[PDB]
Nucleic acid binder design. Structure first.
Length: 44
DNA sequence: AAGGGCGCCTATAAAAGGGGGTGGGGGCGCGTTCGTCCTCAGTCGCGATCGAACACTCGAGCCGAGCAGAC
């Protein structure tokens, strides 16, 4: 979660693209929501 | 047409300061990069509130025993 917050939005966007997260969540690009979704996907 | 007589230049050294040059060096200014500080956002921890479960107390019902009445 510390390194996930240290992802600095842009690389988290590329990671969400890599996992196969749908483009709506990538599109809103809220940082906190993005990092919560990528933490959830790394839990999944 | 011919017959005569003299300063210009050139050269040498030396000083003075200007005229007459573009080239090099130094200084200043501007721009870019890096570092530091501040602000914002996110995450984690703690506290408070709400809900659920368990325990205790009270009330009600049922059963048993005793007493009284009748045969």
């Amino acid at each position: 979660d510390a390194d996930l917050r240290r992802l600095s939005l842009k690389n988290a966007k590329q990671l969400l693209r890599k996992f196969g997260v749908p483009e709506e969540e990538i599109k809103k690009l809220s940082r906190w929501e993005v990092i919560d979704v990528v933490r959830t996907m790394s839990t999944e």
